[PDB]
Design a protein around this ligand. Structure first.
Ligand code: E8C
Ligand code: MG
Ligand code: MG
Ligand code: MG
Ligand code: ZN
Length: 890
């Protein structure tokens, strides 16, 4: 296909200074008239003027009021408008076009589209070209004057970026509104919305300059009651950027708008952030707990882009991580601050080490700054986002808070109102590093390898203690596996946050310190170490790596009980589970392949189980943390450690381990499930959509995790508890009652009960679909067909499609049915969805990413479905690129 390379970046021959748009919405067409005030740059060599413009119907084209004609002065092929160089002026000129577009049939949700009864845009990355002609790349910065007109009854609220400077009536029951956005921007940050929207509003006064900012949050009328928590989260986001980063908002007004049909979470259009409704709307009677967290993070994220993305933007799309990795890091700092729970940071680590590590070991592996693409849209990945964020976070670990803040301000101020590159960020952080080291020859040149080198480093350790000298050494090695991006991998700058625990008394033996590993291996020596320690390594998960702790399970148990760092405690537990999972998996696999009539399994370590019980019974230990220790590692995590994985053998492995532990702990689990009830389900704040007690939410999470364990175990009379739980006013509880009832005859009664509770709220119904989809049912295939026929039907809403299918794809036993029927079902959905929404179709490909990790029968079945999809006529460039890369053809 058509491949863009990072190395070939060149500035344009043209400049666009001002954009003046009139967008006239009618029932069966929208007319877009656009004037671009343009000029020739210093890089111009008299080339043709080529605009991006996809699927536009041309009404008229002119330059300086001279009409241009197709075949004579221009060509248009439905993708690019070429104005021949003879007709391109040599100094400042006005380019005029008028085109017709059709939001009402735009089911791809990119460009201008209709979502229920709201007209909305999505322009990042390449959507502005589906609205009007432009040099649609992020270095083409301009100022925008936008007029929107529409039928007043249908579309009473009209929004675009920036200050509303006029509103006017138009004959025939229409009206208009004009916007001026004074901030220079790329076209990917343009937005318009038209709808019958309702709002909540508040005034925010900025901390330093005392600027009054009007905050509006919008939804369709039915769901206006679900806007309050978003507004609160916006205030929190603003205060956080003021308090931590010294950054104030820069317009008089900020609008946030929920729409039902959206490809991803939300979008940072200047002054007009647009959200998937699932990431803006909640109410405590109609939303699960996880919604509150999601809204907090997504509102935060879009808000933080106002500097990291908007005020400082991208030179080109290869720099994507500069805005997304950095914004996710800001969002994560914010979330950790607002929730004050250790499970926040653990949740980010869990996501990285499951999904992103899988990606990084797959044929899709890329560095956080890719070298090439066909469709830029395929690079909005957990690598670019989540590994990017960890790369952005490592600067803070290396520098500390004070020097990190200095470097960040160098960056943000130097590049204000302009484009930037990853190098500019690394240069700013390098100035801070020099200051920190008090050495103007220190450099971060090695650090750039985190942007250019793909793959996850493996860091391993060896320890030695000299009792006579009271001297302890940690010898560290790093390795990155060669891959298609680099045949020779170089050592990275890896910060290793470390503590040392005395195993006798469980106490800290050193000031926490950060080891700076820069070579392939190094030995770090500590004096005045009074007894042999147990090391507490990569505290806070200080780099995005595979950690090989080389600790015994006895040492791991001591850290789990006694270490200060929540990640090291969690990882020590993770490691004990992984050792057991790999050992039992190999035992089961050998028995199966050798057709043994009898064999042995290694039992779960009894001292580890005792440790779990000790933590669970400690009334002062954290409820969220407890829910992580009784859960095995996620399947996507486990699979990074197994080649030729037999998923059935893995399923049997996990069941054996869970059963071993429950045989010891179920009575503890039951006692805690009951004892936590009063505090977990207390109704303090149940009517307050401005405040969430995240500790209490983690108590519900722990109850629900325990209830699942006990239900799968068939603990005596647990069905009574399941039925009581379905009467709870918390949706998290009553939907958990449905999933845990899977193990009982009462499942279809709870299916109906909860359906009735969910069906009248669009977002709650989607959460019910996910609950059904992930249910541990032998008849799941018949249940999915019932969802398709009775609920999903012909929906093109990405949230409905994702809700029905993705959870099911995580059913290890059923999705990977050795017949291949799981792979076939999802491939049919992908191909169907690709005919109207290529981005969503590529999202639905997610289960196939691990195909070359599976046993060879399942590899063959997956491959056969991937190649079937590839053969589909009129396959999108998005899906075709994804599948060609994934199957080692590109
Ligand atoms: C171009 C914009 C639309 C990308 C947006 N990314 C984003 O929302 N990711 C979350 C996400 C949510 C739902 C989903 F199904 C898939 C996703 F990748 C983001 O970074 N917003 O700032
Ligand atoms: Mg069209
Ligand atoms: Mg997030
Ligand atoms: Mg709907
Ligand atoms: Zn973003």
């Amino acid at each position: 296909p058509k491949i863009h390379y990072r190395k070939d970046y060149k500035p344009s021959g043209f400049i666009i200074n001002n954009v003046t748009l009139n967008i006239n919405i009618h029932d069966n067409e929208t007319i877009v008239r656009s004037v671009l005030d343009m000029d020739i740059s210093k890089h111009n060599v008299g080339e043709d003027l080529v605009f991006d413009g996809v699927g536009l119907k041309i009404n008229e084209i002119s330059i300086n009021n001279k009409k241009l004609v197709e075949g004579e002065e221009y060509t248009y092929d439905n993708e690019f408008l070429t104005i021949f160089s003879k007709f391109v002026p040599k100094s400042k000129f006005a380019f005029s076009s008028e085109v017709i577009i059709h939001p009402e049939t735009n089911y791809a949700l990119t460009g201008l589209y209709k979502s229920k009864n709201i007209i909305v845009s999505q322009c990042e990355a390449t959507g502005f070209r589906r609205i009007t002609f432009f040099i649609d790349r992020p270095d083409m910065m301009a100022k925008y004057d936008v007029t929107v007109t529409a039928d007043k009854e249908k579309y009473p609220v009209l929004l675009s970026n920036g200050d509303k400077v006029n509103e006017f009536e138009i004959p025939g029951g229409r009206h208009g509104a004009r916007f001026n956005d004074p901030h220079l921007k790329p076209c990917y940050l343009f937005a318009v919305v038209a709808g019958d929207l309702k709002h909540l509003s508040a005034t925010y006064i900025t901390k330093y300059t005392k600027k009054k900012v009007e905050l509006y949050v919008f939804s369709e009328e039915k769901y206006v009651s679900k806007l309050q928590w978003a507004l609160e989260c916006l205030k929190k986001s603003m205060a956080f950027d003021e308090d931590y980063f010294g950054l104030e908002y820069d317009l008089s007004r900020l609008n946030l708008v929920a729409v039902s049909d959206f490809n991803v979470g939300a979008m940072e259009n200047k002054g007009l952030n647009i959200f998937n409704a699932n990431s803006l709307l909640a109410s405590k009677k109609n939303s699960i707990d996880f919604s509150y967290a999601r809204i907090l993070t997504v509102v935060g994220h879009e808000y933080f882009h106002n500097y990291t993305g908007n005020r400082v933007t991208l030179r080109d799309w290869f720099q994507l991580t500069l805005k997304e990795g950095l914004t996710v890091h800001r969002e994560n700092l914010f979330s950790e601050e607002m929730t004050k729970t250790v499970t926040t940071r653990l949740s980010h680590v869990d996501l990285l080490r499951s999904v992103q590590f899988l990606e990084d070991s797959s044929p899709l592996s890329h560095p956080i700054r890719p070298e090439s693409y066909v469709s830029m849209e395929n690079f909005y990945t957990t690598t670019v986002y989540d590994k990017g964020s960890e790369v952005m976070r490592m600067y803070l670990t290396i520098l500390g808070e004070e020097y990190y803040k200095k470097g960040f301000d160098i960056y943000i101020k130097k590049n204000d109102g302009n484009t930037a590159t990853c190098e500019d960020f690394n240069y700013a952080m390098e100035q801070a590093y020099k200051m920190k080291k008090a050495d103007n020859s220190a450099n971060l040149n090695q650090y750039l390898l985190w942007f250019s080198q793909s793959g996850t480093p493996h860091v391993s350790f060896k320890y030695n203690y000299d009792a006579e000298k009271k001297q302890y050494s940690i010898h560290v090695n790093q390795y990155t596996k060669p891959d298609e991006n680099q045949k020779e991998k170089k050592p990275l700058f890896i910060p290793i946050s470390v503590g040392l625990i005395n195993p006798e008394n469980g106490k800290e033996m050193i000031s926490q310190t950060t080891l700076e590993l820069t070579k392939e291996s190094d030995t770090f020596v500590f004096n005045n170490i009074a007894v042999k320690p147990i090391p507490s390594l990569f505290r806070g998960f200080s780099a995005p790596v595979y950690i090989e702790d080389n600790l015994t399970d006895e040492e791991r148990i001591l850290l789990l009980k006694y270490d200060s760092d929540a990640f090291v405690r969690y990882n020590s537990c993770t490691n004990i589970y992984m050792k057991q999972i790999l050992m039992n998996y190999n035992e089961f696999l050998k028995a199966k392949n050798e057709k043994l009539e009898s064999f042995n399994l290694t039992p779960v370590n009894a001292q580890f189980i005792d440790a779990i019980k000790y933590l669970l019974e400690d009334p002062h230990a954290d409820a969220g943390f407890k829910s992580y220790i009784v859960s095995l590692p996620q399947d996507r995590y486990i699979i990074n450690f197994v080649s030729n994985l037999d998923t059935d053998v893995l399923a049997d492995t996990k069941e054996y381990i869970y059963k071993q532990i429950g045989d010891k702990l179920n009575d503890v689990y039951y006692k805690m499930f009951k004892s936590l009830e009063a505090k977990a389900d207390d109704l303090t704040y149940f009517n307050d959509e401005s405040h969430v007690d995240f500790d209490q939410m983690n108590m519900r999470t722990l109850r629900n995790t325990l209830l699942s364990l006990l239900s799968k175990a068939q603990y005596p009379n647990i069905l009574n508890e399941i039925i009581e739980h379905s009467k709870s006013p918390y949706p998290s509880n009553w939907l958990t009652s449905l999933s845990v009832s899977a193990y009982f005859d009462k499942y279809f009664e709870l299916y109906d009960k909860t359906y009735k509770l969910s069906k009248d709220d669009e977002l709650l119904l989607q959460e019910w679909l996910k609950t059904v989809s992930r249910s541990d049912r032998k008849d799941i295939y018949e249940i999915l067909k019932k969802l398709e026929n009775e609920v999903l039907k012909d929906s093109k809403n990405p949230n409905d499609i994702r809700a029905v299918y993705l959870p099911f794809t995580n059913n290890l036993r059923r999705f990977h049915d050795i017949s291949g029927k799981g792979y076939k079902l999802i491939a049919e959905v992908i191909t169907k969805t690709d005919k109207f929404n290529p981005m969503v179709a590529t999202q639905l490909c997610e289960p196939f990413k691990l195909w070359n990790k599976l046993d060879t029968k399942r590899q063959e079945l997956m491959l056969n479905e991937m190649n079937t999809m590839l053969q589909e006529p009129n396959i999108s460039n998005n899906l075709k690129e994804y599948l060609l890369r994934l199957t080692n053809k590109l």
